[PDB]
Enzyme design. Structure first.
Site, short mmCIF file in Angstrom:
data_model
loop_
_atom_site.label_atom_id
_atom_site.label_comp_id
_atom_site.label_asym_id
_atom_site.label_seq_id
_atom_site.Cartn_x
_atom_site.Cartn_y
_atom_site.Cartn_z
CG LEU A 31 -5.18 -49.27 48.23
CD1 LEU A 31 -6.28 -49.06 49.16
CD2 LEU A 31 -3.92 -49.45 49.22
CG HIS A 33 -4.82 -54.79 39.36
ND1 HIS A 33 -3.44 -54.93 40.19
CD2 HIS A 33 -4.40 -55.51 38.31
CE1 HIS A 33 -2.62 -55.64 39.70
NE2 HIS A 33 -3.10 -56.15 38.52
CB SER A 35 -12.01 -59.27 35.86
OG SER A 35 -12.93 -59.12 34.94
CE1 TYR A 36 -10.68 -56.64 41.69
CE2 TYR A 36 -11.27 -54.08 42.00
CZ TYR A 36 -10.48 -54.97 42.34
OH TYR A 36 -9.36 -54.73 43.03
N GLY A 37 -11.89 -53.83 38.22
CA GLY A 37 -11.38 -52.62 38.09
C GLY A 37 -10.07 -52.37 38.81
CE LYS A 54 -15.53 -51.86 44.75
NZ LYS A 54 -15.59 -53.07 45.58
CG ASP A 148 -17.24 -63.01 48.21
OD1 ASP A 148 -16.67 -63.94 47.88
OD2 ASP A 148 -16.80 -62.05 47.26
CG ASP A 166 -15.99 -57.23 47.46
OD1 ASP A 166 -16.95 -56.83 46.97
OD2 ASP A 166 -15.31 -58.02 47.29
N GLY A 168 -20.80 -56.64 47.43
CA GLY A 168 -21.02 -57.06 45.99
C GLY A 168 -21.83 -57.97 45.51
C1 LIG Z 1 -12.41 -49.20 48.10
C2 LIG Z 1 -13.55 -50.15 48.67
C3 LIG Z 1 -15.02 -50.25 48.38
C4 LIG Z 1 -15.77 -51.40 48.91
C5 LIG Z 1 -15.41 -52.11 49.85
O1 LIG Z 1 -16.16 -52.98 50.40
C6 LIG Z 1 -14.20 -51.92 50.37
C7 LIG Z 1 -13.24 -51.20 49.64
C8 LIG Z 1 -11.71 -51.31 50.16
C9 LIG Z 1 -11.19 -50.44 51.26
N1 LIG Z 1 -12.02 -49.87 52.09
C10 LIG Z 1 -9.81 -50.50 51.65
O2 LIG Z 1 -9.49 -49.74 52.37
N2 LIG Z 1 -9.17 -51.02 51.05
C11 LIG Z 1 -9.37 -52.03 50.00
C12 LIG Z 1 -8.54 -52.69 49.20
C13 LIG Z 1 -8.98 -53.28 48.12
CL1 LIG Z 1 -7.78 -54.38 47.58
C14 LIG Z 1 -10.18 -53.52 47.74
N3 LIG Z 1 -11.09 -52.80 48.24
C15 LIG Z 1 -10.77 -51.95 49.54
#
Ligand SMILES: Cc1ccc(O)cc1-c1c(N)c(=O)[nH]c2cc(Cl)cnc12
Ligand SMILES: [Cl-]
EC number: 2.7.11.1
Length: 269
Positions: A31, A33, A35-37, A54, A148, A166, A168
């Protein structure tokens, strides 16, 4: 071995070398990517349900690097269950890599607006404003500040709903935030729940007017006064322009709270 990560006080066979993430999840797609991962859409091999996972990019550099990444799980747990917040299922660490498993949400508000290439219809924006305000009201009633709030951290739910994600950068009443959505008082090292209301105001201004926000310069300064750019805010309605002006109040002592905005006639929905 995988170590469950938490702060509230079958299928996996450790005999063979593949990581737990490869062993217990079906990689459907990536979904995002950076620098975080990386973030993957996955199907769990144990229940067949869909999730998003993630993982961090590189192993932990040190104890500070580990506690920094692990703090997101703690910040995510302090929020707790709420319909307008992305639900964390479980988190674990293996090989110095941190994994976060959440519910699967739709595209982010940033992706949604880019796909339409125009200002979102105002009825659609009022729903995204109310849902994120409900999420912030949940955070702020617990003394939590997101720090954020931006379209990239707001994820769509079904039938026009959206969820705030997010965590973080969340703090209990700090790292570098996004300057495009930064409240003015953060420049002087002053933070509070009022900072999230301002960031949500710039978020709505971006998606409802399809204008790019400035990283700096005079245009950045003009938004941190009471000045809305009449070039872009021309299409807004009276009710929507009224709400944005209150959220973009430069003085945090005078800026409206999320609870106050949700009690207005247009948002009482
Ligand atoms: C995996 C994750 C962890 C923590 C968070 O706070 C949100 C997400 C997340 C989702 N739960 C999701 O459905 N799509 C995402 C798409 C991107 Cl690019 C990034 N994170 C997510
Ligand atoms: Cl500047």
């Amino acid at each position: 071995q995988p170590r469950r990560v938490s702060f509230r006080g079958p299928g996996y066979d450790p005999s063979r070398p593949e990581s737990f993430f490869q062993q217990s999840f079906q990689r459907l797609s990536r979904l995002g990517h950076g620098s975080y991962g990386e973030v993957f859409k996955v199907r769990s091999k144990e229940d067949g349900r869909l999730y998003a996972v993630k993982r961090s990019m590189s192993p932990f550099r040190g104890p500070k690097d580990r506690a920094r990444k692990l703090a997101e799980v703690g910040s995510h747990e302090k929020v707790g269950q709420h319909p307008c917040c992305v639900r964390l299922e479980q988190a674990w660490e293996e090989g110095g890599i941190l994994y976060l498993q959440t519910e699967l949400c739709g595209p982010s508000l940033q992706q949604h607006c880019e796909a339409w290439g125009a200002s979102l219809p105002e009825a659609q924006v009022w729903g995204y404003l109310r849902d994120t305000l409900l999420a912030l009201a949940h955070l702020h009633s617990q003394g939590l500040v997101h720090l954020d709030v931006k379209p990239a951290n707001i994820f769509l739910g079904p039938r026009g709903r959206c969820k705030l994600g997010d965590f973080g950068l969340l703090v209990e009443l700090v790292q570098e935030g996004d300057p495009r959505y930064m409240a003015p008082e953060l420049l002087q090292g002053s933070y509070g729940t009022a900072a999230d209301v301002f960031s949500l105001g710039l978020t709505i201004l971006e998606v409802a007017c399809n204008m790019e926000l400035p990283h700096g310069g005079e245009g950045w300064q003009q938004l941190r006064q009471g000045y809305l750019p009449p070039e872009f805010t021309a299409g807004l309605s009276s009710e929507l322009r009224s709400v944005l002006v209150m959220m973009l109040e430069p003085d945090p002592k005078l800026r409206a709270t999320a609870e106050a905005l949700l009690a207005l006639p247009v948002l009482r929905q």
